[PDB]
Structures are given as C-alpha cells and as structure tokens.
C-alpha cells in the first residue's frame, strides 16, 4: 500500500515548498516522489510527521548516507551530529553536546547574563548607525555567532575582527553549498568524486570553513588549562579525547573535534540570527505589534534593567510574538531529511526501508486546519482570549523525535533575550522613503527574509 504520487522534473526547485502544497492538495498528506534513483516520501501535517518521527521514531532516526562528506574528514567514528548516521557515533556526540551545553550554564543564570552582555554589544552597534537605514543581518549574525563561539570556543570576537568576518563569510557560503546542485549530484552519483577538479571545487567553502576553525582550535589547544574544569565545549571534548586515547571505538578523536565544533558553531549562527532577522522585519511591517511588545517590556522589566529568562513567564505577549516569528518565518520549511531503518506504516501507507523522508515542517506551521490565519503574522496564534500564552502542538519548528534540534533550548534563550533587549532600547521602522519590504523569504535550505533595511531609533537617552 504505497503512497500516491505523479517526478524528476515535475518538482520546482526554485520554490519547492509551494510545489509540495500542490502535490499535497492533489495526492494527500503522504505522497511519493522518485528523485535521482532515490525514493522519497514527503510527510505533511502534524500527524504524518508525528507518526513517522515519534510513533515509529526507532525506525526513522537515521539520515540518508552522504558520501561527499568524506572530504570534510567524515568516517565511521567521525560523523558530527547533524549529518551523522543513527548509531553510536551520533548518540555519543549528541548526548555529549546536550549535556556539555547544559553544564556550561545553558539552563542557568551564567549563560543568560552572557547573552545579555552580547545583546548590549549588539544594541551599541545598532546605536552607532545614528538612526540611518541599514541591513541588520550582519550584526545579528555576529552577535549570535559570539554566543555559540563563547560556548564552543571559550571566546567572542570583535565585530571588526577580520578573522571573525572570514569565519562568518565562509559559513554563510558553506551553507549555500549544502543545497547547491553540484553537491547533491556527486553525493547521488559517487564516482565523479575522484576527478581532481570536481573534488577541488565542491565544498570549497565548507573545507575553507573547517580550515579556518582548525586555526582557532590550534590556538585554543595552546591556551587550554587541563588542570582546571573545562570552560567550554572544545575543552570538554579535548578532556574526553585524552581519556579515550587507545580506544578505537570512541568518537572523541581529532577528526571529529573539528566536525562537531563546526556543526554546533555553524548551526548556532545561521538559525537564531535568521529568525531574529525575520523578527525585526515583522516588527517594522507590524508596528502595532512592536509597540505592544515595548509596552509589555516596560510593565515587567523597565527601560534600563537587562532582561532575564524569569521575565518570560510574566510576558505572554512577547512570548507569543517570538513564537509567531518562528512559525511565520518558517526558517527550515522542509526540515532535514531522515531515512527509514525498517518498513513502517504512516497514515495507512506502507513506507519501505531505505526511503528518504522529507518532514514538511512548513505544512505543520502553516496548516490551515490548525491555525486561525496561517498565512498572516498573527501573535494571537499563541494567545487565548484572556491573553495567556498557549503553544499548540503544531508548533514544530525544531521537528520531533530523537533528532529534534538539540539547539532548541539555546535558541529559546537567545530569541527571548536578544529580541527583548533590541525592542527594549530601540524603535524599528521602515526607512522614511523606501517601499514596504516583502514578507516572503528567499527559499534555500534555510529561508531568510528578502533583503530589507530598517532604522533603529533609541527610545531614551538615559
Ligand atoms: C531558531 C533556531 C533553530 C531552528 C528553527 C532549528 C531547526 C532544526 C531542525 C528542523 C532540525 C532537524 C531535526 C530533524 O532531523 O528532524 C535541527 C537539527 C539540529 N540542530 Fe537546529 N535549529 C535551530 C537552532 C539551532 C542551534 C542554535 C543549534 C546549536 C546550538 C542547532 C543545532 C542542531 C543540531 C546539532 C541538529 C542535529 C540534531 C541531530 O541530528 O540529532 N540548531 N534543527
Ligand atoms: C536524494 C534526493 C535529494 C537530492 C536533492 C535533495 C533536496 C534538496 O537538498 C533541497 C531540499 C532540502 C531539504 O532539507 C529537504 C528537501 C529537499 C527538497 C531535498 C530532499 C532530498 O534530500 C533531495 C531531493
Ligand atoms: C559541520 C558542517 C560543515 S558538515 C556539512 C554541513 N554543514 S553546514 O555548515 O552546511 C550547515 C549548517 C547549518 C545547517 O542548518 C541547520 C543546522 C542546525 N539546526 C538547524 C538548521 C545545515 C548545514 C555543517 C553542519 O552540519 N552544521 O550543522
Ligand atoms: Zn577554552
Ligand atoms: Zn487562559
Ligand atoms: Zn537604551
């Protein structure tokens, strides 16, 4: 009983999410596609995604093999987390990252204070624009990159630092290669790998990004004090590397240190800062909502004191707006692919072993059966009539199951602290004479808002 479907060129790749709406209205919530000899089943809506990732989660936590990553040093015990196959290498790094982030202060007050210190740096770089129009994306990336740089590498960088700039530039470009035509065709057709020029051109920026990290990791190895408890995730990793010398089963090796640190670092940049970029864009398209958040900040926090996570429970409207920015911004619309380890049943359809699953997360965040006004920016999607915060089950921007985004608690903290700090100290607006920016993003693996400019005008002198 396989799922219905049409394939290879009946799929618009310059606007895939809208194409998958058409096939879902045609064939239903679970449909098939055959793309380059790989069988694909697309999952749509909460129940199909939840059935596959939670109910059959034991059989859907694997990823599709990616032989092109062999250039970045990937091997059976060197697989990072994000593209790692389901197995001991993935499980050890995932638990290590999850608990190392926690022990470095994630769920606690030292990280909150760190993030608001970085928000102040970001606020100051905003004020240095003298109320003139500017694209906020670059400074967002730097402020958010410094948070993950702090957790993984034990340091931040100056916004003018050329090494930081190169690091961000290579990462943004290396992300663009993950969803480029060349990358998948050699991952699809493997043999083309050996051809020298094809090997030297693909993942040039991802290989450059890793090279630039090796340089920071080498300096960190110089400054690390093993006689003291690990200050950051790289030190925690290196300590585990030492204990594991002589153990060829450990994923704590030199090949995996650069991959894991790159994984967390690059993920820590591109996600939260893109969401924040949608946030500001939507605050200048909906100044009524901006003003209402600014009112809630004043009644709970004030205009001088820095925000804390203990405020959020008393700020349902600001929490609603932030959730709505993630729901509307829809930053990863087609998720990250999984693959079945067994035959499974989703929505009464049989899905064979070895099928690439596409969790259509956009079809969950914008499900017309679930949300009042899915195609509008509407904070009341997360509010009830008395103004209490409610989170529907369809809020799945981080996916579900054993592979669900391990960054989620850091993202939640960063989103709240950076967002409220910016709105606490500035008033954001479309620039005086410019056309009203689009609310449609540019589709890639990650969906950023269409490029726009804003003006940040302080709310106070003192
Ligand atoms: C707004 C911010 C973010 C969003 C919307 C987001 C979304 C996602 C999604 C949809 C997945 C795929 C889960 C699946 O396989 O079904 C994922 C995985 C992952 N994310 Fe995030 N992410 C965000 C921020 C972050 C941050 C800040 C980090 C690191 C600190 C991070 C690290 C990871 C990692 C390592 C994985 C792989 C998890 C695994 O395979 O076990 N993400 N994320
Ligand atoms: C094997 C078949 C490979 C080749 C190109 C891949 C797609 C692209 O990468 C773009 C996009 C990224 C999202 O993550 C997941 C959805 C989507 C459509 C991918 C799914 C899958 O992986 C594809 C179809
Ligand atoms: C270590 C690697 C260079 S190995 C090859 C792939 N990249 S990448 O820089 O192209 C990348 C970055 C972010 C991302 O999107 C995310 C991540 C996390 N949560 C939600 C969305 C996807 C891919 C690195 C990687 O795996 N990072 O995680
Ligand atoms: Zn350190
Ligand atoms: Zn209520
Ligand atoms: Zn101020």
Curated annotation (Swiss-Prot):
Binding site for heme: 405
GO CC terms: cytoplasm; endoplasmic reticulum; endoplasmic reticulum membrane; intracellular membrane-bounded organelle; mitochondrion
The EC number(s) this enzyme carries: 1.14.14.-
One GO BP: estrogen metabolic process
Effect annotated for changing residue 305 to G: In allele CYP2D6*25
Result of changing residue 104 to S: In allele CYP2D6*89; >90% decrease of monooxygenase activity towards dextromethorphan and bufuralol
Induction: By pregnancy.
Annotated positions binding substrate: 263
Catalytic activity, as annotated: (5Z,8Z,11Z,14Z)-eicosatetraenoate + reduced [NADPH--hemoprotein reductase] + O2 = (8R,9S)-epoxy-(5Z,11Z,14Z)-eicosatrienoate + oxidized [NADPH--hemoprotein reductase] + H2O + H(+); (5Z,8Z,11Z,14Z)-eicosatetraenoate + reduced [NADPH--hemoprotein reductase] + O2 = (11R,12S)-epoxy-(5Z,8Z,14Z)-eicosatrienoate + oxidized [NADPH--hemoprotein reductase] + H2O + H(+); (5Z,8Z,11Z,14Z)-eicosatetraenoate + reduced [NADPH--hemoprotein reductase] + O2 = (14S,15R)-epoxy-(5Z,8Z,11Z)-eicosatrienoate + oxidized [NADPH--hemoprotein reductase] + H2O + H(+); N-(5Z,8Z,11Z,14Z-eicosatetraenoyl)-ethanolamine + reduced [NADPH--hemoprotein reductase] + O2 = N-(8,9-epoxy-5Z,11Z,14Z-eicosatrienoyl)-ethanolamine + oxidized [NADPH--hemoprotein reductase] + H2O + H(+)
Subcellular localization, as worded in the UniProt entry: Endoplasmic reticulum membrane; Microsome membrane
Cofactor: heme
Annotated S-S bridges: none
Effect seen on changing residue 66 to A: In allele CYP2D6*88
Biological function: A cytochrome P450 monooxygenase involved in the metabolism of fatty acids, steroids and retinoids. Mechanistically, uses molecular oxygen inserting one oxygen atom into a substrate, and reducing the second into a water molecule, with two electrons provided by NADPH via cytochrome P450 reductase (NADPH--hemoprotein reductase). Catalyzes the epoxidation of double bonds of polyunsaturated fatty acids (PUFA).
PANTHER family recorded: CYTOCHROME P450 2D6-RELATED, CYTOCHROME P450 508A4-RELATED
Protein's name according to its UniProt entry: Cytochrome P450 2D6
Gene this protein is translated from: CYP2D6
């Amino acid at each position: 009983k396989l799922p219905p479907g049409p394939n290879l060129l009946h799929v618009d790749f310059q606007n895939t999410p809208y194409c998958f709406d058409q096939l879902r209205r045609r064939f239903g919530d679970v449909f098939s596609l055959q793309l380059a000899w790989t069988p694909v089943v697309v999952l749509n809506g909460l129940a199909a995604v939840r059935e596959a990732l939670v109910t059959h989660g034991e059989d859907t936590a694997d990823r599709p093999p990616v032989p092109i990553t062999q250039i970045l040093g990937f091997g059976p015990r060197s697989q990072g987390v994000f593209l790692a196959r389901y197995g001991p290498a993935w499980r050890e790094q995932r638990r290590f990252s999850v608990s190392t982030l926690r022990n470095l202060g994630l769920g606690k007050k030292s990280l909150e204070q760190w993030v608001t210190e970085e928000a102040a740096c970001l606020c100051a770089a905003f004020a240095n624009h003298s109320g003139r129009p500017f694209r906020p994306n670059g400074l967002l990336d730097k402020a958010v990159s410094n948070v993950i740089a702090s957790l993984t590498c034990g340091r931040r960088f100056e916004y003018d630092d050329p090494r930081f700039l190169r690091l961000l530039d290579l990462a943004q470009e290396g992300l663009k290669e993950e969803s480029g035509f060349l990358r998948e065709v050699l991952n699809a057709v493997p043999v083309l790998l050996h051809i020298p020029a094809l090997a030297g051109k693909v993942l040039r920026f991802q290989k450059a990004f890793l090279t630039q990290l090796d340089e920071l990791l080498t300096e960190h190895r110089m400054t690390w004090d093993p006689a003291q408890p690990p200050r950051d995730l790289t030190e925690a990793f290196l300590a585990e590397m030492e204990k594991a010398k002589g153990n060829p089963e450990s994923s704590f090796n030199d090949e995996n240190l650069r991959i894991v640190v790159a994984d967390l670092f690059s993920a820590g940049m591109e996600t939260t800062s893109t969401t924040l970029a949608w946030g500001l864009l939507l605050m200048i398209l909906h100044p009524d909502v901006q003003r209402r958040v600014q009112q809630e900040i004043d009644d709970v926090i004030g205009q001088v004191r820095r925000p804390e996570m203990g405020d959020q429970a008393h700020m349902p409207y600001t929490t609603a707006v932030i959730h709505e920015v993630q729901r509307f911004g829809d930053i990863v619309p087609l998720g990250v692919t999984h693959m079945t380890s067994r035959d499974i049943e989703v929505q009464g359809f049989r899905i064979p072993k070895g099928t690439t699953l596409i969790t259509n997360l956009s079809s969950v965040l914008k499900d017309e059966a679930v949300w009042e006004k899915p195609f509008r920016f509407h904070p009341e999607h997360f509010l009830d009539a008395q103004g209490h915060f409610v989170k529907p089950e369809a809020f799945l921007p981080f996916s579900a199951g054993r592979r669900a985004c391990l960054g989620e608690p850091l993202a939640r903290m960063e989103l709240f602290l950076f967002f409220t700090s910016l709105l606490q100290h500035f008033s954001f607006s479309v620039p005086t004479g410019q056309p009203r920016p689009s609310h449609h993003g540019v589709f890639a693996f990650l969906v950023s808002p269409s490029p726009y400019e804003l003006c940040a005008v302080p709310r106070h002198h003192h």
